[PDB]
Amino acid sequence: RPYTVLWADDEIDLLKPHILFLEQKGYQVTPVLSGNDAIEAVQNNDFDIVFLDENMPGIGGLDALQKIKELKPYTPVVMITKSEEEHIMTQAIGGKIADYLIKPVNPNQLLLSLKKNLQQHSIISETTNTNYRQEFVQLGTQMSGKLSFEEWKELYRRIVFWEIELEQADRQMGELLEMQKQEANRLFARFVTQNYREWIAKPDTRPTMSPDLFKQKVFPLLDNGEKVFFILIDNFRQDQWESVKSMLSEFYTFEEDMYLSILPTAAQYARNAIFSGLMPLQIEKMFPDLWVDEESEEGKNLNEEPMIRTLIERYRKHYSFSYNKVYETKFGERLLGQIRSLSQNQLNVIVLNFVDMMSHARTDSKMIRELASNEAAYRSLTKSWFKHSTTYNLFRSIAEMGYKVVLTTDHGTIQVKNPVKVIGDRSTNTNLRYKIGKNLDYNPKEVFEIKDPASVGLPHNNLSDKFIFTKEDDFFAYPNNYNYYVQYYRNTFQHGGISLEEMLVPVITMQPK
């Protein structure tokens, strides 16, 4: 079927050359001479696009626009007029005009406007597929050759970008990236297993990790006299920052970067390392009060504010600061009300936990299994919360206050696929991406064995304790009810292990506009 065009213009006869040209290109043009005729035509038909002229007898062009957008809000309306007035242009833009063309009109301009407003989705789709197939060989070739951390960053940023651009494409085109994604995870998995021990041993030569975050990305700005809001959104992947960055460009300049999470990828160690500036083991030694062991019943991140103080004082700084933790809407509302009473501190730290709460609810919540069945839904559901929670307005006010913002997280999360059999003490931790214990049977290769936790800067309730970690998208399953739990945990989001999603996380330094 060919596309239909409704063209309303009292001088429609002067446009015969254009109309023949359009009919020549396969379009079915319907002419009328008044806006009343135009509205009636829209009432009784389903045109694909409407060309309107501003100056007509009787009803005006912009009035027909308003009435037409009430009847067919999804049908693009192009305004084609002699007038160059600024109030006419403005009103048309406000009337939701799809495009505005000033007479005299190049016939080829009409052609462009018809392609862009009737086929931009189908066109963008075929280009994206083409441009992806173009870059496919480079991707596999880019990762094939062993590469540096800085290159690993760009490789992942690239895969994320493609993962988002291909949400709309067909399965076949989706799977080509999944393979590349998981193959990258496999290759990234072994990449960290080779160097993780030496990053702990050699802090000078290592990449930025959780204990260095405040030192590399926060202290420079504070020392430079800049006022900062450090926003920690627990469990915020790279692709979740891509999903929300468009909302924030309206208020901020982005200085995007990434850093490496320590293992395990969970708040107990990675987030405590961030605010303390130390590895968990050094937290237990130097500050035994502030560390909470794994076997304890109490929460494991209740002493982040005092840790911040030790970090500030340990570096001989005298920053004024504040700490707020929003784990419940109503608390985040009160914070949004008193936000501007924090204008005195050089550093305001806000922790948001809903995304981690939601990521976990993907397992034990019927609601979130549906609303985040897949990663695209997960990202969309993340966008909805960012917008309609206090978070959006929170950023808006901070931008008004002139505070720079370092937006980052403590770890990501990954959709788990394959079970890894493990058996341990009943008192063994219940995390599915890492386990702590002594009497643990498993296959050493299938996991990432750490028999000397002190070397990787991790404390232990005993001193025969060993750490094991899943890699890629694996997850631990116990032989009891193995058939059941593997069903229950397949395709859920789990953090604590090793993967590009979990470890490679964004740290965005944002300047208000």
Next chain:
Amino acid sequence: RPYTVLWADDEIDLLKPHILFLEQKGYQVTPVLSGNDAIEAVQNNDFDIVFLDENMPGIGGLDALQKIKELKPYTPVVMITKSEEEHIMTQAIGGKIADYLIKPVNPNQLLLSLKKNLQQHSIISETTNTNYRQEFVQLGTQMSGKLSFEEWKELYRRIVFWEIELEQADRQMGELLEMQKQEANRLFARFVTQNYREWIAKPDTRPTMSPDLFKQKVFPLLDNGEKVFFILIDNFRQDQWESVKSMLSEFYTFEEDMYLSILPTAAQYARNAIFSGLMPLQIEKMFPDLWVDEESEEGKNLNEEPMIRTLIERYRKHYSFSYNKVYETKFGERLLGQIRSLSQNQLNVIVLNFVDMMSHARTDSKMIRELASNEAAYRSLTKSWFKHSTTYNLFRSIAEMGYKVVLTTDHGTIQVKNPVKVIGDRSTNTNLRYKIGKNLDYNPKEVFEIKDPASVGLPHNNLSDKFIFTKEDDFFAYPNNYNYYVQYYRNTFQHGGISLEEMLVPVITMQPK
């Protein structure tokens, strides 16, 4: 602040007057001679917009665009070239260009695209605010007089339209419509309580209601030899339809309409009326084995496929039909996978329950309390579900199967606000918007008294039973721990009573494009 423009063209010299015109109108313009110089400037500067000439030395104009979008995807780009080729248009469109202007370009045309690509949201907001006040007058006029059912449809449609249209505006602009909506609900409740008993007694004259839906909206299509998918999304408000119809306009054209759900606005009564074509009392009188009374705890809508068979038979029809109920996520994926097999039926009934489950979860799920805290969030969450669940690809597949779709619901829901004291019994039901009881104590002025359930086509277990319904945003609250349950149920979504959201519900007839 004045907006920054980056213009890249090898013949920049010639475009100088265009630049003075832009710079005259308060636009900072930065000119480069090639993409390479353009690609640099974007990294080293935060530009508001880019102007890309296609044909330049070395770097391809389109290949620069591809880079700029990957660096600063949030920044619009306008292409201004002498090219009139089709693929350059196509490639530029596929590169996510904002506007494409053929040389020679009118200066006012460059002004047009600058207003339309850097301010559009602000202009639309002002126009929306202005236009609503002008229409606010008429709406007040429409409500002033006595209203027919058809006028109630049109009024409610326009309230919802402005409800969504004003999501992007100040609070006070939202409180004007809120007052308008509340007044509309008050009159509509008055309108229902005056005429409801007449409607059940005069089928030939009453407006379309639940037991009439199939004969009025489905059978005429099948009689005309059309293939119909009847999709009932439980608990789907007008504003929820309004939120998704953009997604569907890509594949269907719509004949939008609304009908009245019978009371109570609950699946047990309204939805069974739909599929049986009878009032609940008639379902019990004629098909007692298919009716499930209130006392029992078994599901109340488990015999809808038999009811459809009796409806087809009752009207001496010979339709081939299927019936599928989706509440699990996995089952929906199975249905989509096998959607083609339903091509052997004239009528395909699909029931989707998630939106109702989701709506109820707004009460007892701290997840949905956050994700659907307000009506705007409720709509945003319905949109993401529709898109990223199997529902989107279900309508997609149905259109490709040349099937006509009748999308509707059994009732809406309303955010409750004010309690209405009621004394009942352990036997009394738990619905917040209506009660059934032999001995109910309440203030008759705060409810709609049905002492004669049979007169409104309702069954009951005891001869002295009666029905009472809340109106507007009221909800029933029992005296014991009244204070706790008032604050607990306040601001939740509840259905079963009288309101525009609950009763005046959409029925869309859709034709595949």
